[PDB]
């Protein structure tokens, strides 16, 4: 078996985000539980990526996972320079370069699940004004923002959407103040797509009580605020990391040198309802799932950047 092997994991910021980074740790710990492999987990930061990952290498890791686009260039450099080490990255963002054979990149079509979140929030909102709180801007987050705004307009052409960015995935207090300002300005539902920062958005909703709703992200976040999180736009990082790593442990060769793309139809993303609010939002949830099937069948082409969004809006 694979018991002698080691799989390592490096994230940016804290593991304990109730979402994206946490899901990567869940996968690695489940691999340890099921296969009895060795694991190493490291929470890192930009000023020390190079040293932290060089250390996972020196621990003779058989596979090193990096999580999130902020690790893109470092994971690429280390893979390029260490041909005998295998690396995989969740959401590497690369422009010019060709991916080396010992690096596997995973890309999620986040705009697809964000479209479901926007459609849902737009149908559910009583004020007709909804919010989006993002983490760090860039290609990944813009896919969430434009997918959300497009799905919202698809549900109601005159929907009002307020978008703000915390600017980091690790500022809970700024998530809270951003959300508090939105709720005070007539927003009644906020999609928090902001890592740990978004948990502060949830805190703001809890502090304001009933009628301040959240669309959660990455994992089912209804348990964080069972009266306020209506639905969650999940990203199935843990399932994918487990299955890809298990295959790698069986073959010993990384299926790398490429980017694997996952959206709704690959079961890489999904929309998960809070059962405590079922009687009240089930009809909208079911309509949202039909929208998801239209996306999966290629009927709705979901925008993901400014150009595709502006075209989508003009062609509605
Ligand atoms: N530490 C992080 N680093 C990079 N991207 C992140 C991080 N946390 C969250 N994200 C991204 O923001 C989205 C919403 O939390 C996630 O699905 C992921 O794409
Ligand atoms: Cl605070
Ligand atoms: Na804080």
Numbering used by the authors: 8 to 323
What did the paper state?
The final crystal structure of BmpD was refined to 1.43 Å. The structure is a monomer and consists of two domains connected by a linker region, characteristic of the SBPs. The N-terminal domain consists of residues 8 to 115 and 243 to 269, and the C-terminal domain consists of residues 116 to 242 and 270 to 323. In BmpD, the central beta sheet of both domains contains six beta strands and the N-terminal domain has four alpha helices, whereas the C-terminal domain has six. The crystal structure also unexpectedly contained an endogenously bound ligand, which had not been added during the crystallization setup. The ligand was bound in the cleft between the two domains, and the electron density indicated that the ligand was a purine nucleoside, which was confirmed to be an adenosine by liquid chromatography-mass spectrometry (LC-MS) analysis. Furthermore, the aromatic rings of the purine base form stacking interactions with two phenylalanines. Compared to PnrA, BmpD has a more extensive water-mediated hydrogen-bonding network connecting the purine base of the nucleoside with Asp19 and Asn28. The main differences between the adenosine-binding sites in BmpD and PnrA are found in the loops flanking the binding site. Asp27 in loop 2 of PnrA points toward the ligand and makes a hydrogen bond with the backbone nitrogen of Phe87, whereas Asp19 in BmpD is turned away from the binding site and forms ionic interactions with Arg77.
